[PDB]
Amino acid sequence: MISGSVRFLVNLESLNGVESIGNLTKHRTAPVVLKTSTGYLVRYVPVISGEALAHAYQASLVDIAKKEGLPVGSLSSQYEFIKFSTDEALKIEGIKEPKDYNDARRFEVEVMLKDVIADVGGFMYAGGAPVRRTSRIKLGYMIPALRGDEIPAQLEAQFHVRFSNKPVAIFNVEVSSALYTFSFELDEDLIAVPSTFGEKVKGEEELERQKAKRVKSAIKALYSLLSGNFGGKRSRFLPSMKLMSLVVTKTDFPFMPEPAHDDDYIKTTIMRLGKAKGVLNGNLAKAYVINNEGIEVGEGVTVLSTVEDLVVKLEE
Amino acid sequence: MISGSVRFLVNLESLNGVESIGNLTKHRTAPVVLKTSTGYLVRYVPVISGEALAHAYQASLVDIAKKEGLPVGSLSSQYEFIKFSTDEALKIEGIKEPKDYNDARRFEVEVMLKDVIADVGGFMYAGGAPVRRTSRIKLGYMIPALRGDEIPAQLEAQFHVRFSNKPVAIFNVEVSSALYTFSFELDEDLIAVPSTFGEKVKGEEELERQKAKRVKSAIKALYSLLSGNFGGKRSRFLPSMKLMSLVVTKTDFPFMPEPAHDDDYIKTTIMRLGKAKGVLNGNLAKAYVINNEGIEVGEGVTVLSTVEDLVVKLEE
Amino acid sequence: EKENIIGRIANLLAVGFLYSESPTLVDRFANALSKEAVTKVLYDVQRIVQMGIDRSEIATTTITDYPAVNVNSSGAKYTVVGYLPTSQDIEDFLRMIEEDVYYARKAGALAMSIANRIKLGSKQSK
Amino acid sequence: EKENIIGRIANLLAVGFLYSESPTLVDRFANALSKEAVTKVLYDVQRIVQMGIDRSEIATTTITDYPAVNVNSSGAKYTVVGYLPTSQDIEDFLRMIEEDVYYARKAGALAMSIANRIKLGSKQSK
Amino acid sequence: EKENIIGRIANLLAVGFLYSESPTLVDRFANALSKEAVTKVLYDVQRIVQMGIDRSEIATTTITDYPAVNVNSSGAKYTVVGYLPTSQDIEDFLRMIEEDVYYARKAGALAMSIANRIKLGSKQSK
Amino acid sequence: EKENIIGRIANLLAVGFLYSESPTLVDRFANALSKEAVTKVLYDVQRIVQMGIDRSEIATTTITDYPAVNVNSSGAKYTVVGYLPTSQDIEDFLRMIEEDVYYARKAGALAMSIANRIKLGSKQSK
RNA sequence: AUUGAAAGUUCUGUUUCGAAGAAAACCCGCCUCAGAUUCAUUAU
C-alpha cells in the first residue's frame, strides 16, 4: 500500500462551487469541531470536495493510458466518467448484460479488459445481477489544519461588473485563502485482479500480462494530484499553490499516517510505522519525507527535494 | 478480562447510513437524554452502530487467522458472516445437523474446529435442537460525549452533481463532525472453550493445543478497532481521526470502566478498580492509560505513547 | 402568540421555497438540531426573499381582505396568504428555538404544507 | 371535525404508502409514543408526496363527483378517494397528538385499510 | 442589556444598508467567523453613516415619541425606529463577539429584517 | 488597564478628528498593517492637538464632575468626555501594537464612534 | 351491630442467542467599476 499526507498553502482560491443565491456564487463550507484551551468549539470553514480530486486523477490516468497504448473505454475517452452504470452506456460500448450470478465474473472481466478507469476507480452495475467493484484509490475532503486556537483560513466576496455601451451586468464571486491538508491511500497489490469470486474465465492471461503497465500508470497518475492540477474556475481565478510538507509510506500491511493537523506529525507516524511493522509481522516498510518549513523530522529518514523524485522512486 | 474506554475526534464523517429519502442519503441519528443546569433534556444526535465495528473486527480476525495458518470457514473466507445459521451454510461447509440434545456438544465442536470466527464471535443454529454461543467480544454504539450543556456534534447536508454532455445527476450527502466515545469488553479466558454442557468429545485436545494461538489472534485483532479501520464510504469521504484518551483494564474479575463522558474518568476508574479488587478477593488488576489532552490521570499508573505498545503489552 | 410567530415563519419559508423552487432550506430547517442551523436558514431564506423584493417578483398585497404575498417564479404566479415575520418575530422565534428546536420542525411542516397546496393548485389550473 | 382531520391525515399516509410502496412510515406513525415520531412521519410522507407531485405521478382529480388523488407507482395506477390535509389540518392534528397520541394510531389504522383495499382491487383486476 | 446592544448594532447595520443600497456589509457581518471580520464591518458601516451625517442625508429624529433615524438615499426616504449604538455598545458588543461570534449573526439577521420591512413598505406606497 | 489605554487613545484620535475636521488620520489608524503607520498617526494627531492647545482652541476641563476636553473648530464647540493619553499610555500602546495591530483598529472604531455621536448632537441642536 | 358475624388465590420463572445501506459521480463553461476635477490668492 501507498499512504500519503500532504500540506498545501493556497491564496485567493475558488475551485469548488455550490448552489448560488441571487448574483452571488458561494464557496463550499462545512462544520468542524476544534479543541481550544477553553474546551471544544464548532466553526464553519471553507472546504473542497474529494470528487474533484478523483475526477482530476481519473482524467490524468486517461491521458497517460491513451499515450501508453493501454485500452480506454469509448465513453471514458471523452471526460465523462459515467462508467458502466446505466444500460445506455452498455449499449454504446457494446457489452452484454449479465444473465445470472454465475456469469457476473465474466461481465466484470469484459468491463476490465476495455477500460483501465473501471479497473482502477471501480464501478457499479445495478440490475438483476448487480456487480460491484470498490475503487483502488481513496481520497477525502480537503480541510485546513486545525492547529492552535485560530483557524488559518478566510473567506470573502468580490465585486465584478460587465461592460456595455447600452445599459438596460453585476455579479459577486466568493474567494478564500487557507492552508489546506489532505491524505490519500492507494493499494497497488489489487490492480488488475478480479474481485468477484468464481471460477477461472478466459481473458485473465491478458490482465496478468498488462498488470505491470496498469500499476505503473496508476502510480504515475498521482503526479497531477501532488502537483496541483485540480479544481475549476482556473481560467480567471488561477490559484497560487506551494507545497510545504509531504509524507509517503509504502507498506505490505494496512497503515494510516497521522493527519497533517499538528506541527509534529512526521516523527509520530515514523515511530508508529516502526512499531506496527514490529507488531503485525510485516516484511516491508519504507518512508519518504519532503520538508520545506523546517519542522522536526527525526533520524534515519530519506529526505527528497521535489515530487518527481518521489514518483520515480515509487515506480522503481 | 480486558475492558477499554476510548475517545476519538472525527471531522467530516459519514461511515454509517440509513434509508434514503429522495436524492438525500441520511446519517444515523438517535435520541439522547442529557443533564444541564436547568434539568434534563432530550436531543437528537448522530451515532454509529456497533455492528460495523464488529464486522471490521471479524474481517481483521479473518485476515490474521489466514496469515497465521489457523483454520477459516469456507463461507467466512469470503467476507460474508452468515456463520452457520441456515441449512444452506451447513450444506456448503459440509457439517451434519445435530440429531438430539445429547449430540449438540459434538456439533458445536465440529463448528469450533473449522472457523475461528464462530468460536470468537459466537453463533446460532435454529431447529429441532437449537445451539447457541454468545460472542466473546462485546461492543456498543458510538456516542459523542455528553459533557456540559452543549453537545460537541454537528450534522449538515452537502450538494453534488454528476457531469454529462447531454443533460436529460444531482444528489445530497449527509456529513457529520463530532467527538465520539465508545467502550469495549473482551474475555479471553473463555476462548477455545466449549460452552454447551455435556460429556467429553474427541477433538478437544486440538482446541487445547490451539488455544494460545486463538487468544493471541483475538488480542491482535483489536488493533484495527483501536486504529480506525471501520465504516463505509471511505473511497471519497475518508475521515480524519485522532486518538485523545484511552483506558485499558486487565482483571481476573468482572469490571466496567466509567464511560468517557466526563473529563475526569481515569482517576475514578482506577480508584474503583482498586476498591473492587479489594472487595471481590481478586488476584490481578492492571491498568494502562494513553493521554494526549493533558487531563488528570493520577499516581502509580503506567503511561504509554501509542497503541502498538499497548497491543504488545497485552500479548506479552 | 407562539402559534402566530410559527405561522409567520412558515409563510417566510414557503415564500422562499416557491421563489427559489428549492426545498433545501426547508429541509435544513425541519432537520435542525441546533440554533446555528435554524439561524443560518432564517438568514438565507430572507436573503432569497430580499432578491425577489428588489426584482419586484415578491410583493405584499391584499386578496379577497386578507394580507398576502405574491411570488413570481419562472413564469409561475403563486400567492401565499398571511404576513411575513417581523424582526421581533424572528427574535422571539430564535428564543423559542433556544428553549426547544421542536418549533423549527413545526414551522417546516407548516411551510411544506403551504407550498404543496399552492403547487398542486397551480398544476391543476395548467 | 376531528374525524374529518384524522380521515384527511389517513388519506395522506395512504397516498404516501401507495406511491413509495413502503409501509415503514405508516408503521412508525401507528407505533408513535411521542409527538416527535408523529411530526417526523408527517414531514417525511409529505416530502414523498411532494416528489410525486413534481414528477406529475401524484395529482388531485374528481371521480364519479368526489374529490380524489391519482397515484402512479411502478406502472400501477391507484386512486385514493378524499382530500389531502391542509396546513391547518396538520396543525390541529398535531394539537390532538399533544393531548393524546391515540389519534396517530387511529389515522394509521385508517391509512392501512385504504391502502389494503386499493392493493387488493388492483391485484384482482390484473 | 445584551439584547438592547444587539438591537442597536442591528439598527446601525440597517441604516448603513438602506443608505448605501448594498447588502455587502450585512453579508460580511452575518458570515463572520472572526473578531477581525466583525470589527472591519463595524468600522466600514460607521464610515458610510458618517458620510450620510456630513451630507445631512442621515439624521436622528423622533416619530410618533420614539427615537428614529431618517435616511435619504437616491430620492427614497426611509425611517429606522430606534437608537444607533454608543461607543460603549460597540465595545461591549466586541467583547460579546470575542466570547461568541453568534452575536454577529443575530445582529445581521435583525438588520436584514429591519431593512426588508422598510423596503417592502416603501415599494408598496410607490 | 489595556482598555483604559485604548480608550484614552480613542479620545486623542477623536479630539484630533473634531479639531481638524478630517477623518484621514483615523482612516490611516484603523487601516494600519504595520507599527510604522500607527506611530506616524500617533505623532501627526498629537501635532494637530499641540496646535489646538497653543491656539487655546483645545483645552482640558471638567463637566458635570468628569474630565473632558473642549474643542473649538470653525465656530463649532465640541466636548469629548475622558482623559487624553499620557506618554506612558503611548509607550504601552505601541508595545500592544508590536504584539497585535488589532488594537489600532479597536482604538479607531472607538474614536469614530465618539466623533459621530458628538457631530450628531451638534447638528441636532438648533 | 343488619342472611349480619369469622377468611390473602399465596408461593417458584431472562425472548436469549447472530448480521457492514455497500459499491460508482466536477457546479463548470463567458464578463474590467469605467470614464472629469489645481489646495492658490495675502504675510520682513
DSSP string over D63-95:
E--EEEEEEEETTEEEEEESPPPPHHHHHHHHH
What is the C-alpha separation between F53 and F71, in angstroms, rounded?
A: 9
Number of residues that this document lists for chain B: 316
SS3 B40: strand
Rounded to a whole number, what is the distance in Å from the CA of A225 to chain B's nearest CA? 15
User: Cell 473505454 sits at which residue?
Assistant: A73
SS3 F100: coil
Kindly determine whether residue C24 and residue A42, on different chains, have CB atoms separated by under 8 Å: no
What is the C-alpha separation between A140 and B236, in angstroms, rounded?
A: 5
CA dihedral C61, C66, C67, C71 (to 10 degrees): -50
Q: Are B16 and B48 in contact (CB under 8 A)?
A: yes
For residue B195, give every residue at least 6 positions away whose Cβ sits within 8 Å of its Cβ, in sequence order, or none. B108, B132, B133, B134
> Measuring CA to CA, which residue among C95, C70, C67, C71 is closest to residue C8?
C67
What is the C-alpha separation between E47 and E25, in angstroms, rounded?
A: 12
Q: Are A80 and A124 in contact (CB under 8 A)?
A: no
How many of the other CB atoms lie within 10 Å of CB of C16?
A: 26
For residue B256, give every residue at least 6 positions away whose Cβ sits within 8 Å of its Cβ, in sequence order, or none. B3, B183, B185
CA dihedral C76, C80, C86, C92 (to 10 degrees): -120
What is the C-alpha separation between B125 and B83, in angstroms, rounded?
A: 9
Instruction: Quote the DSSP letter at residue F86.
Output: P
How many of the other CB atoms lie within 10 Å of CB of A285?
A: 18
Q: Are D27 and D40 in contact (CB under 8 A)?
A: no
Distance in angstroms: CA B197, C1' G10: 35
Residue E73's DSSP bridge partners are: E76
What is the C-alpha separation between D11 and D82, in angstroms, rounded?
A: 7
Contacting residues of C for B175, CB less than 8 Å apart: none
Q: Are A247 and A269 in contact (CB under 8 A)?
A: yes
What does each C-alpha distance from E121 to A286, C88, E55 come to in angstroms?
71, 17, 25
What is the C-alpha separation between F24 and F41, in angstroms, rounded?
A: 10
What does each C-alpha distance from D86 to C114, C116, D89 come to in angstroms?
8, 9, 5
- Dump strand ranges (E) for chain B: 2-13, 24-25, 29-36, 39-46, 123-125, 131-133, 137-138, 143-144, 153-161, 170-178, 180-186, 240-251, 285-291, 302-303
Distance in angstroms: CA B239, C1' G14: 40
For residue A208, give every residue at least 6 positions away whose Cβ sits within 8 Å of its Cβ, in sequence order, or none. A192
What does each C-alpha distance from F90 to B104, D19, E7, F33, F83 come to in angstroms?
91, 75, 34, 18, 13
| Sign of the dihedral through C-alpha A115, A119, A120, A125 | positive
Q: Is E27 on the interface with A (CB under 8 A)?
A: yes
Pairing of strands B24-25, B170-178: parallel
How wide is the angle at C-alpha B288 spanned by C-alphas B286 and B293, nearest 5°? 150
Taking each helix axis as running N to C, give the angle between helix F2-20 and helix F35-54, from 0 to 180 degrees, rounded to the nearest 10: 60
For residue A35, give every residue at least 6 positions away whose Cβ sits within 8 Å of its Cβ, in sequence order, or none. A146, B9, B293
For residue B240, give every residue at least 6 positions away whose Cβ sits within 8 Å of its Cβ, in sequence order, or none. A140, A143, A183, A259, A261, B10, B11, B12
- Name the experiment that determined this structure: cryo-EM
User: Cell 446592544 sits at which residue?
Assistant: E5
Which candidate from D40, D50, D90 shows the least CB-CB separation from C110?
Answer: D90
What is the C-alpha separation between A83 and A123, in angstroms, rounded?
A: 7
DSSP sequence for A254-286? ---PPPTTSS--SHHHHHHHHHHHHHHT-S-EE
Residue E53's DSSP bridge partners are: none
- In the 3-class helix/strand/coil scheme, how is B169-213 assigned residue by residue? CEEEEEEEEECEEEEEEECHHHCCCCCCCCCCCCCHHHHHHHHHH
Breaks (C-N over 2.5 A) in chain D follow: 64
For residue B30, give every residue at least 6 positions away whose Cβ sits within 8 Å of its Cβ, in sequence order, or none. B44, B45, B46, B47, B141, B143
For residue C8, give every residue at least 6 positions away whose Cβ sits within 8 Å of its Cβ, in sequence order, or none. C82, C83, C84, C85, C86, C89
Rounded to a whole number, what is the distance in Å from the CA of D27 to chain B's nearest CA? 15
CA dihedral A34, A40, A42, A46 (to 10 degrees): -10
Residue in C25, C33, C35, C40 to test binding to B, most B beta-carbons within 10 Å: C33
Contacting residues of E for A150, CB less than 8 Å apart: 34
Q: Are A50 and A141 in contact (CB under 8 A)?
A: yes
Pairing of strands A180-186, A2-13: antiparallel
For residue E16, give every residue at least 6 positions away whose Cβ sits within 8 Å of its Cβ, in sequence order, or none. E25, E26, E45, E46, E48, E49
At residue D82, φ and ψ (nearest 5 deg) are 130, 180
Q: Are F114 and F27 in contact (CB under 8 A)?
A: no
Kindly determine whether residue C37 and residue B156, on different chains, have CB atoms separated by under 8 Å: yes
Going by beta carbons, is chain A in contact with chain E, meaning 3 or more pairs sit under 8 Å apart? yes
Protein-contacted positions of strand G (CB under 7 Å)? 16-33
Cell of B311: 497491543
> Measuring CA to CA, which residue among B154, A26, A43 is closest to residue E27?
A26
For residue C105, give every residue at least 6 positions away whose Cβ sits within 8 Å of its Cβ, in sequence order, or none. C30, C32, D39, D40, D43
What is the C-alpha separation between F77 and F58, in angstroms, rounded?
A: 10
Residue ranges of chain C whose CB lies within 8 Å of a chain E CB: 35-36, 39-40, 42-43, 46-47, 49-50, 53-54, 56, 59-60, 84-87, 90-91, 94
E84: left (phi over 0), alpha (psi -120 to 50) or beta: beta
What is the C-alpha separation between B57 and B34, in angstroms, rounded?
A: 31
Q: Are D121 and D21 in contact (CB under 8 A)?
A: no
Q: Is D24 on the interface with B (CB under 8 A)?
A: yes
> Measuring CA to CA, which residue among A127, A104, A83, A100 is closest to residue A194?
A104
What does each C-alpha distance from B249 to A66, B75, B182, B303 come to in angstroms?
57, 35, 15, 13
Which candidate from B19, B21, B31 shows the least CB-CB separation from D47?
Answer: B21
Residue A199's DSSP bridge partners are: none
Cell of B52: 460495523
Contacting residues of A for B235, CB less than 8 Å apart: 122, 134-135, 137-139
How many of the other CB atoms lie within 10 Å of CB of B120?
A: 25
Which candidate from B24, B44, B157 shows the least CB-CB separation from C33?
Answer: B44
Greatest Cα pair distance in chain E: 44
Residue ranges of chain A whose CB lies within 8 Å of a chain E CB: 24, 43-45, 150-151, 154-157, 159, 172
A240 burial type by CB count under 10 A (0-12 exposed, 13-18 middle, 19+ buried): exposed
Q: Is C1 on the interface with B (CB under 8 A)?
A: no
What does each C-alpha distance from B274 to B183, B255, B256, B267, C59 come to in angstroms?
20, 11, 13, 11, 73
Cell of B266: 481515569
CA dihedral F76, F82, F85, F86 (to 10 degrees): 120
Q: What is the resolution of this structure in A?
A: 3.5
What is the C-alpha separation between A257 and B70, in angstroms, rounded?
A: 30
What is the C-alpha separation between B247 and B252, in angstroms, rounded?
A: 17
Going by beta carbons, is chain C in contact with chain D, meaning 3 or more pairs sit under 8 Å apart? yes
How wide is the angle at C-alpha A176 spanned by C-alphas A42 and B158, nearest 5°? 55
Kindly determine whether residue F124 and residue E60, on different chains, have CB atoms separated by under 8 Å: yes
Please name the helix (run of DSSP H) or strand (run of DSSP E) that holds residue E78, with its range, or none. Answer: strand E76-81
Q: Are E88 and E73 in contact (CB under 8 A)?
A: no
CA dihedral B92, B95, B100, B105 (to 10 degrees): -130
Please name the helix (run of DSSP H) or strand (run of DSSP E) that holds residue F104, with its range, or none. Answer: helix F102-124
DSSP sequence for F13-79? HHHHHHHHT--HHHHHHHT--SHHHHHHHHHHHHHHHHHHHHTTSEEEEEE--EEEEEEEETTEEEE
What is the C-alpha separation between B98 and A262, in angstroms, rounded?
A: 58
Residue in A26, A32, A146, A155 to test binding to E, most E beta-carbons within 10 Å: A155
SS3 B114: coil
What is the C-alpha separation between A236 and B261, in angstroms, rounded?
A: 50
